[PDB]
Design a protein around this ligand. Structure first.
Ligand code: SF4
Length: 183
């Protein structure tokens, strides 16, 4: 828990390693104090995959959902705690819950209004993507190349370009490669 814990996953140091999908999920969670089902699964299983323990995951999700008075702890415990425990096997289930790879993410239902799951290289408009990439210090020529990949449907290549420019396709591989480059 020394490096990956409920508090450090909100740090800039750790979150600088997140791919765009995880950044988007963390932003929706930070702003709305909630995520709908597919986003809860995408994010919680990514965080389990980077080493967030069961106890630290319950801290993370309970604090995020009850922040700013969004819901009481009693409501969290009655309506969400079991679902997060289930994703960690803590009620004894033996289902496979491995982190989702990019193909799995892309194959989930596309996000609608109020959804943060999916792949931003597909799901965002070029103008939203461009603004995000500018905030990550990419230049116009870089952005044009990333958008070219997006328009061709090559979302994982777009994401690989972003990795290269800011330093099997899998968000956890993006994280691990980026985090290794901090060490
Ligand atoms: S390509 Fe994969 S890791 Fe990158 S933003 Fe899309 S789903 Fe996430």
């Amino acid at each position: 828990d020394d490096e990956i814990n409920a508090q450090s996953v909100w740090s800039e140091e750790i979150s600088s390693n997140y791919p765009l999908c995880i950044k988007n999920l963390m932003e929706g969670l930070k702003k709305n104090h909630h995520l709908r089902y597919y986003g809860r699964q995408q994010l919680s299983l990514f965080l389990k995959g980077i080493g967030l323990s069961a106890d630290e995951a319950l801290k993370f999700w309970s604090e995020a959902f009850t922040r700013n008075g969004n819901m009481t702890m009693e409501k969290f415990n009655k309506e969400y705690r079991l679902s997060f425990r289930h994703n960690y096997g803590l009620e004894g289930n033996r289902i496979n819950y491995k982190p989702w790879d990019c193909h799995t993410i892309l194959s989930k239902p596309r996000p609608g209004r109020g959804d943060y799951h999916g792949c931003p290289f597909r799901d965002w408009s070029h103008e939203r993507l461009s603004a995000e990439l500018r905030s990550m210090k990419l230049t116009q020529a870089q952005i044009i190349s990333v958008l070219d990949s997006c328009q061709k449907g090559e979302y994982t290549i777009a994401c690989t370009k972003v990795f290269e420019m800011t330093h099997i396709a899998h968000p956890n591989l993006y994280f691990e490669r980026s985090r290794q480059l901090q060490k």
